[PDB]
Amino acid sequence: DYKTFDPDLWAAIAKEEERQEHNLELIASENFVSEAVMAAQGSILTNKYAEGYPGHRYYGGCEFVDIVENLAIDRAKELFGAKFANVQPHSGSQANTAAYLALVEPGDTILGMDLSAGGHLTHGSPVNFSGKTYHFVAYGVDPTTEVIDYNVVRILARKHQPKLIVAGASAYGRTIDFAKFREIADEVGAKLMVDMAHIAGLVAAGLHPNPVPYADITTTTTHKTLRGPRGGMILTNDEALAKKINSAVFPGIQGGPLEHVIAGKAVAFKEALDPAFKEYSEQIIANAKAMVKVFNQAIGTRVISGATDNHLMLIDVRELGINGKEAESILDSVNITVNKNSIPFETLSPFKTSGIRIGTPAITTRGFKEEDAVKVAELVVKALQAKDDNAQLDEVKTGVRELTEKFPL
Amino acid sequence: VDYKTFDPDLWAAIAKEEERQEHNLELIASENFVSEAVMAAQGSILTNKYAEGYPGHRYYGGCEFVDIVENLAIDRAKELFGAKFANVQPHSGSQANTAAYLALVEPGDTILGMDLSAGGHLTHGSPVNFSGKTYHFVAYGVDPTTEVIDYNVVRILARKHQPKLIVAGASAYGRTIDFAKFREIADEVGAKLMVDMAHIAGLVAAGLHPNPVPYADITTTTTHKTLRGPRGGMILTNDEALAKKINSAVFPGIQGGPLEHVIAGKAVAFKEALDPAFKEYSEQIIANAKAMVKVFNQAIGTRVISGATDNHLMLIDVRELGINGKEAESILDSVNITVNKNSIPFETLSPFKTSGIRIGTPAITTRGFKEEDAVKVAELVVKALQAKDDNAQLDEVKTGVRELTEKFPLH
Ligand SMILES: Cc1n[nH]c2c1[C@](c1cc(CO)cc(-c3ccccc3)c1)(C(C)C)C(C#N)=C(N)O2
Ligand SMILES: Cc1n[nH]c2c1[C@](c1cc(CO)cc(-c3ccccc3)c1)(C(C)C)C(C#N)=C(N)O2
Ligand SMILES: *Cc1c(COP(=O)(O)O)cnc(C)c1O
Ligand SMILES: *Cc1c(COP(=O)(O)O)cnc(C)c1O
Ligand SMILES: [Cl-]
Ligand SMILES: [Cl-]
C-alpha cells in the first residue's frame, strides 16, 4: 500500500527477491540473513542519533539504544573471547580504516597479503586508502603449493622491518597459521593485525583457529560467514588499544552509528551463540570440501592449492580456454552466480582474471547438503566444459532449477 | 513474534525504544521519523546483495535489479537538487565528506571551514577528526555581537592563508548561508568550494534555502535530517572530472560494498521529497522554528544565539539560568524532552559541558505539530529550565509533553 506511491522502487525489489530465489549464489562473501536480522534493520532505530558509546553519548534518549549496542558488544566478546569489542564500524573497510589508525602512522611500512594471492583491497592495494596511506609490502603464496610460505613471509619481514603485519584474506581457502604470524611479528618487532571477515563464522564455531589471542587487533565484517547484517567490527585484548580503536572509529572516521544495523549485529551474534550455528558451519566446510573433490577430479577446473579448509575455493579455468570473466558470464547465463577472481601469480587484468571464486555459505544456508553441493559443482563443470553448447547449457539450467525448487527461501 | 521469542533481550529493548519515540518530544535538530516505506526498504532482502562497483560496472553479476534501485536513487537525487552527477554510496555524512576531500585536496593542504564552537561540524576541521588530522584547517566563525558569519572575515582569512579549498555548511548554525558570497571569496583566492548541506538538504530541496549545488565544486549531504531519508551520505557535483574522482574515492577508495538496502531507502526518500507536499512540510518546519524562537526570545534565561532562525534549528545559551548545556539537556531529559547539549560561539566551558542546547523542529513537524504546538513546546522548555527542580512545575511539563504526544501520535 505504501508501495503504491513508488511503484518503480518496489517492483525492482520484488524482481530481486525473485532473482535470489531462482539463482544459485556461489559468491563466497554472500549469505542470507534471518528474518529477525532484516526486522532489526527495518526498525525505528534508524531514527536515533547516538554519537558516542553506551553510557557516554553526546545527547539524550539513548537509554534503550544502549541496551541494543551493549548486547552487540557483549555477544561479540562471548563469541570470540575478546576483552573489548567495537560494533560501530559501518563496514569491514571502515573497521580496517580505524584499526590501522590505532596501530600505525601514515607512511609506515605494513606487510600484507598480495591481492592476487588472495588478499583484500584494504590490505594494501594502491587504489585503496590502505595502499595510498601506508607503505605496503606484499607477501603471497608459494607458486607450486599455492599456500602461504611462512619462511618467505619471515624473510620479507626481516628485510622490510614493518611496523605492522596483516593476516587474513578474501580468496584464500587454507588455514591461516596465526601463531606463526605472531612469531614472525614478534621477531621483527611489528604488531599483528588479523582481518577475519571471511572466516569469522568459522572462528565463532570453533572450526578455524581463533586469531584474537594472537593479534593485537582483529577486524571483521558482520556479514559473510557470520550471517549478520552488512557492517564491521573491531576486537582487541589490550585496553590501551581499545581506547585508540574507540577514538579512531568516532570521532575519528565516523559520525553517528547505524543503530538499526547494530541491532541486527546483536541478533546475528545470538544466532551464532546457538549450537545450531556450529552445525551450520560444519556443513559450510563439508559442502566446500565436497565441491573441491568434484573439481579436483574434473577436467579444466584446477582448484588452487588442491584443497580447501574453509568455506571457499578458487578455480583456475585457463585450461578451458577461457578467463574468469567469461567463466563468470557462462555460469550467470545458467543462473549460477560466482565472481571472477585473480589467482596467485595472475597474468591477466584484474578485470578479466584467470579464475573464479566459489563459496558455500549461502547455499548451505538454503539447506544444501554435501549431496546437493556435489551436484552444484557438477553443474558448474558441465556449464564450463560445454563450449557454447545450448543443449548442454539448458540441461544445466534445468539442474539449477531442480536445486532451487528443492531448497526455496 | 517467533523470532522475538528467541531473543527477548534484543526485542524488548526495541519495544522500549518504540515507546520512547512515541512518548518523547524529539527536539534533536538532526533527527526525524522516516516513513514506513523507508524502513521497509532497509528491512528488505537487499542486505544480502554484494554490489561492489557502480550500476553498469559492478565487479560481478547478479546486480540487474540492484542497478535499477541505485539508479533510481541517483536519478532522483539529480532531480531533487539539480546536479549533473550524484553518488549515493557513502555510508554516512562523514564518509561523504571523506571522499569529497579526497577529490579536492591532498593531505596537508590548507582548508577553510567553520569552527566547531561557531556551528561547524566535526568533519570541518576538528583535530580529533580525520579532517583536522589529515589537512591544515583554518577556522572561521561568527561575529561575537551578531553571531552570524562575517563574510569580510572569511575574505580576510582566505586571502591571508590562501586555502586550496573553502568549506561551507554547519551543524549548529540557524541563519541563511550565503553560498554566492562563498563562491566569490573562493574565486578571488583561487580556492575550490565545498558545501556540506547535511542539515539543510531538505530545506534546499523544498526551495526554502538557497541551493549550494550551482556554486559548490562538490556538495555533500546526509540523506537523513531534514531530507528525512535513511541514515547515509551523498555526494553531488556538476563537474564531470570531479564526478570521476568522487566515484573513485568512494569505491574502492574508502569503502567496499555499499549498503544497497539503505540505498533503496534513499530512493524511497528522494521520491517523497519530490512530492509537492514535502515543500509544505519543509515550510512548516521553518515556521515552527521561528515560532519557537519568538518564545525563547521573550524568556530571559533562554538567549537564542544570533536572536533569530532562518531554518529548522536554534542554538540556546542557557548560562543566565545558572546551568550549563549538560544540565539543561538532562533537566529536559527528565521531563521527556530530548535535545543535545551544544557549544555556542566563543564557548568558555568544556566541550563536554557546553554553554548551550541545540533544538530543531524537523521531527515534531513530521508528526504534525503546527505553530500553536511549536509555541507550547518552547513554553514547556522554558518552564522546565526555570523550574529549579520544583517537581510540581516539572510534572506540569511532563503533562504538557504527554498532551502534545497524544495529540500527535506516530505512525
Ligand atoms: C572488490 C575486492 N576487494 N578486495 C578483493 C576484491 C576482489 C576483486 C575482484 C575483481 C573482479 O574484477 C577486481 C578487483 C580489483 C581490485 C583492484 C583493482 C582492480 C580490480 C578485486 C573480489 C573478492 C571481489 C578480489 C580479486 N581478485 C580479492 N582478492 O580481493
Ligand atoms: C558530535 C558532533 N559532530 N559534529 C558536531 C558535533 C556536536 C558535538 C556535541 C558535543 C556534546 O557534548 C560534543 C562535541 C565534541 C566533539 C569532539 C571533541 C569535543 C567535543 C561535538 C553536536 C552537534 C552533537 C557539535 C557541538 N557542540 C557540533 N558543532 O558539531
Ligand atoms: C569483504 C572484506 C572486507 C570489506 O568489507 P566491506 O563491508 O565490503 O567494506 C574487508 N576485509 C576482508 C578480509 C573482507 O573479506
Ligand atoms: C550530521 C552531519 C555530518 C555527519 O553525518 P554522519 O552520518 O553522522 O556521519 C556531516 N556534516 C554535517 C553538516 C552534519 O550535520
Ligand atoms: Cl570479499
Ligand atoms: Cl549534527
3-state secondary structure of A350: coil
What DSSP designation does A53 have?
E
Residues of B within 8 A of A20 (CB-CB) are 45, 48-49
- Angle, alpha carbons A28-A78-A206 (nearest 5°): 45
Cβ of B43 and A43 within 8 Å?
yes
Q: Is the CB of B144 under 6 A from ligand 3?
A: no
What chain B residue is nearest to A48 in terms of C-alpha separation? B31
B93 burial level (CB within 10 Å; 0-12, 13-18, 19+):
buried
3-state secondary structure chain B: CHHHHHCHHHHHHHHHHHHHHHHCEECCCCCCCCCHHHHHHHCCHHHHCCCCEECCEECCCCCHHHHHHHHHHHHHHHHHHCCCEEECCCCCHHHHHHHHHHHHCCCCCEEEEECCCCCCCHHHCCCCCHHHHHCEEEEECECCCCCCECHHHHHHHHHHHCCCEEEECCCCCCCCCCHHHHHHHHHHHCCEEEEECCCCHHHHHCCCCCCCCCCCCEEEEECCHHHCCCCCEEEEECCHHHHHHHHHHHHHHHCCCCCHHHHHHHHHHHHHHHCHHHHHHHHHHHHHHHHHHHHHHHCCCCEEHHHCCCCCEEEEECHHHCCCHHHHHHHHHHCCEECEEECCCCCCCCCCCCCEEEEECHHHHHCCCCHHHHHHHHHHHHHHHHCCCCHHHHHHHHHHHHHHHHHCCCC
Report CA-CA distances (Å) from A83 to A75, A181, A222.
Answer: 11, 21, 18
Annotated binding site of A for (6S)-5,6,7,8-tetrahydrofolate: 115, 119-121, 239, 349-351
Report CA-CA distances (Å) from B203 to A135, A385, B52, B263.
Answer: 44, 58, 32, 21
Residue in B119, B285, B265 with CA at minimum distance from that of residue B206: B285
What chain B residue is nearest to A126 in terms of C-alpha separation? B253
Q: Is the CB of A90 under 6 A from ligand 3?
A: no
3-state secondary structure B37-100: HHHHHHCCHHHHCCCCEECCEECCCCCHHHHHHHHHHHHHHHHHHCCCEEECCCCCHHHHHHHH
Cβ of B48 and A32 within 8 Å?
yes
Between CA A216 and CA B403 the distance in angstroms is 54
B44 burial level (CB within 10 Å; 0-12, 13-18, 19+):
buried
Between CA A49 and CA B17 the distance in angstroms is 13
**CB A168 within 8 Å of CB A120:** yes
Between CA B267 and CA B74 the distance in angstroms is 8
Cβ of A13 and B49 within 8 Å?
no
Closest-lying ligand to the alpha carbon of B195? 4
Cβ of A12 and B72 within 8 Å?
yes
Alpha carbon of residue A243 to chain centroid: 26
The atom number, within ligand 3, closest to the CA of A119 reads: 13
Phi, psi of A340 (to 5 degrees): -55, 145
User: Whole domain around residue B111: which residue ranges?
Assistant: 39-274
Report CA-CA distances (Å) from A374 to A225, A371, A378, B285.
Answer: 20, 5, 6, 60
C-alpha cell at A228: 549478520
Between CA A348 and CA A326 the distance in angstroms is 13
- C-alpha A167 to ligand 1 mean position (Å): 17
Active-site residue flag, A375: no
- C-alpha A192 to ligand 3 mean position (Å): 18
**CB B168 within 8 Å of CB B177:** yes
The position carrying cell 565472481 is A339
C-alpha cell at B49: 546483495
The position carrying cell 512545575 is B393
Phi, psi of B170 (to 5 degrees): -155, 160
The DSSP element (H or E) to which A314 belongs, if any, is strand A312-316
A·B CB contacts under 8 A? 248
**CB A50 within 8 Å of CB A182:** no
B350 burial level (CB within 10 Å; 0-12, 13-18, 19+):
exposed
Which residue in the set B91, B253, B338 is minimally distant from A91, CB to CB?
Answer: B91
Alpha carbon of residue B341 to chain centroid: 15
**CB B228 within 8 Å of CB B254:** no
3-state secondary structure of A88: coil
Other Cβ atoms less than 10 A from the Cβ of A189: the count is 10
The position carrying cell 573464479 is A356
Active-site residue flag, A154: no
The atom number, within ligand 2, closest to the CA of B118 reads: 29
Between CA B217 and CA B212 the distance in angstroms is 9
Q: Is the CB of A361 under 6 A from ligand 3?
A: no
Neighbouring residues of A323: CB distance < 8 A, sequence distance ≥ 6: A317, A340, A348, A352, A353, A354
Residues of A within 8 A of B262 (CB-CB) are 258
Between CA A225 and CA B8 the distance in angstroms is 24
Cβ of A44 and B32 within 8 Å?
no
Residue B122 marked ligand-binding: yes
Other Cβ atoms less than 10 A from the Cβ of A151: the count is 11
CATH of the domain at B265: 3.40.640.10
**CB A229 within 8 Å of CB A41:** yes
Experimental approach was: X-ray
Letter string b/e over residues B198-229, b meaning 16 or more CB atoms within 10 A of that residue's CB: bbbbbbbbbebbebbbebbbbbbbbbbbbbbb
**CB B246 within 8 Å of CB B77:** no
Q: Is the CB of B341 under 6 A from ligand 2?
A: yes
> What is the experimental resolution, given in Å to one decimal place?
2.3
Closest-lying ligand to the alpha carbon of B120? 2
Cβ of B61 and A332 within 8 Å?
yes
Phi, psi of A367 (to 5 degrees): 110, 5
**CB A230 within 8 Å of CB B52:** no
- C-alpha A34 to ligand 5 mean position (Å): 20
- C-alpha B232 to ligand 2 mean position (Å): 19
